[PDB]
Curated annotation (Swiss-Prot):
Source species, domain of life: Eukaryota
GO cellular component terms, semicolon-separated: adherens junction; azurophil granule lumen; blood microparticle; cytoplasm; cytoskeleton; cytosol; endoplasmic reticulum membrane; extracellular exosome
SUBUNIT field: Monomer and homodimer. Interacts with SDC1, SDC2, SDC3, SDC4, NRXN2, EPHA7, EPHB1, NF2 isoform 1, TGFA and IL5RA. Interacts with NFASC and PTPRJ. Interacts with SDCBP2. Interacts with PDCD6IP. Forms a complex with PDCD6IP and SDC2. Interacts (via C-terminus) with TGFBR1. Binds to FZD7; this interaction is increased by inositol trisphosphate (IP3). Interacts with SMO.
Record localization: Cell junction, Focal adhesion; Cell junction, Adherens junction; Cell membrane; Endoplasmic reticulum membrane
Tissues expressing the protein: Expressed in lung cancers, including adenocarcinoma, squamous cell carcinoma and small-cell carcinoma (at protein level). Widely expressed. Expressed in fetal kidney, liver, lung and brain. In adult highest expression in heart and placenta.
Entry protein name: Syntenin-1
Molecular functions per Gene Ontology: cytoskeletal anchor activity; frizzled binding; identical protein binding; interleukin-5 receptor binding; phosphatidylinositol-4,5-bisphosphate binding; protein heterodimerization activity; protein sequestering activity; syndecan binding
Residues of the full protein shown: 108 to 298 of 298
Keyword set, alphabetical order: Acetylation, Cell junction, Cell membrane, Cytoplasm, Cytoskeleton, Endoplasmic reticulum, Lipid-binding, Membrane, Nucleus, Phosphoprotein, Repeat, Secreted
Annotated membrane topology: Peripheral membrane protein
Length: 191
């Protein structure tokens, strides 16, 4: 989680699209969905991200409907956005043991238990937290088996980005779980 506000310049695709859905939370506007292969993913917008401004207009108190509206009525040429990076999330780094375990049980993305003497324990991982990303990759809507596969196919060092479930549940709300599985950008970023 990069601590600060950064600026991104977007450009609508051939189809007029930017690949973004935004959700109103606590009188801000947050990224609910980033579509793979979109101007939004290229410029590196992330699920969870706060949008403070669009085109220099403040977003405070905007509905989702309204933020969606504004994006459609902007010249594709240059959409400036000012972004606070994943303010609702934290990242934990952990080490697998000899037996290739970090030390927790989870279900539907939600960590539900932590195991004694594990790295999960030593690093103070919490239950009631939804997994957002592993080792830099968005894992939301993937099935547990897939999430579990990512964890085995990772090095010894595992980095998890987590979000309190109450907040996660407020964000994905009004999002059908297939759009997540299919459309939500699950790719390693591109250099």
């Amino acid at each position: 989680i990069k601590q600060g506000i950064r600026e991104v310049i977007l450009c609508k695709d051939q189809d007029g699209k930017i690949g973004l859905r935004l959700k109103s939370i606590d009188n801000g506007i947050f990224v609910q969905l980033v579509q793979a292969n979109s101007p939004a993913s290229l410029v590196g917008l992330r699920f969870g991200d706060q949008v403070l401004q669009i085109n220099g207009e403040n977003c405070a108190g905007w509905s989702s409907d309204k933020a969606h509206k504004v994006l459609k009525q902007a010249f594709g040429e240059k959409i400036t956005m000012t972004i606070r990076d994943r303010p609702f999330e934290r990242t934990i780094t952990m080490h697998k043991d000899s037996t290739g375990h970090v030390g927790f049980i989870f279900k539907n993305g939600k960590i539900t238990s932590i195991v004694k003497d594990s790295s999960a324990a030593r690093n103070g991982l919490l239950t009631e937290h939804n997994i957002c990303e592993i080792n830099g990759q968005n894992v939301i809507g993937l099935k547990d088996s897939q999430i579990a596969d990512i964890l085995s196919t990772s090095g010894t060092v595992v980095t998890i980005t987590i979000m309190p479930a109450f907040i996660f549940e407020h964000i994905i709300k009004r999002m059908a779980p297939s759009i997540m599985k299919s459309l939500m950008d699950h790719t390693i970023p591109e250099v």
